[PDB]
Design a protein around this ligand. Structure first.
Ligand SMILES: O=C(O)CN1C(=O)c2ccccc2C1=O
Ligand SMILES: O=C(O)CN1C(=O)c2ccccc2C1=O
Ligand SMILES: [Cl-]
Ligand SMILES: [Cl-]
Ligand SMILES: [Cl-]
Ligand SMILES: [Cl-]
Ligand SMILES: [Cl-]
Ligand SMILES: [Cl-]
Lengths: 74, 75, 75, 75
């Protein structure tokens, strides 16, 4: 359900199942931010700005949370 | 017509008129905690902190909901 | 504790038990159109296409709601 | 001011003008899959199926977001 934007290709991208679960668990727990890793890369998702920050370079990639329709369609 | 109120007599969610829906939705978007509107000789207050509509003439309380559209939109 | 049902006897939204809230929310996140649960030896079905809980013994329909977290989060 | 686009140069989400926000939000509420708007003569298309704004003069694609207000509202 979480996505990050890639400015090189101009497209939204999905996280791995593990990183998506780490982000979503912190989101549901009321945390304002969450740290996660992808190989040698280290990131912080800042929920107050909806931005992923690369801890090493400071590169910012916007993030989004997909929303399910309420009510659900038949 | 994104706001609805539940009718326990029929067991269904009901839409508001375009005018009353707009009054409710403008107060919602403006950050107000409640909003009043009129319909059929009755004044109602929608309490956004509880998502309940109160009939100011009778005191009767009916629940309300805000419909949400999918993000992203489907093709 | 994100799902609620309206109780017209008390005039208030009511929380589900942690177990029933998890059962409902798991079906909601899986894309199901409905979910079954039990409470106090009674069987209920939540219909997500209408946002209504149906008492399987009496047929009584009560509305349900899903609480929504603000996006972005406040600091 | 509920819609935002991300400015990669400053690294911040940005609000639209009241007029462009209204154009975008009206198309969103009408169920349209995309909407065109202008900032002066500069042309843009917001694609709701991808949540991307396309600058129709440079071709640059910027992501967009819809802010969501908490339900129920806090007191
Ligand atoms: O007064 C009642 O008994 C039920 N009732 C209406 O007739 C009505 C009309 C427009 C908006 C809300 C309501 C509502 O709750
Ligand atoms: O059966 C009824 O009369 C009312 N009722 C309950 O006592 C109850 C308990 C837990 C979840 C839902 C319900 C519900 O609708
Ligand atoms: Cl970007
Ligand atoms: Cl990065
Ligand atoms: Cl009423
Ligand atoms: Cl329960
Ligand atoms: Cl019941
Ligand atoms: Cl540009």
């Amino acid at each position: 359900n979480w996505r990050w934007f890639d400015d090189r290709s101009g497209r939204w991208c999905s996280y791995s199942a593990s990183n998506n679960s780490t982000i979503d668990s912190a989101w549901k727990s009321g945390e304002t931010s969450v740290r996660f890793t992808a190989g040698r890369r280290r990131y912080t998702v800042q929920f107050t700005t909806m931005v992923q920050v690369n801890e090493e370079t400071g590169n910012r990639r916007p993030v989004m949370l997909t929303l399910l329709r309420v009510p659900r369609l038949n």
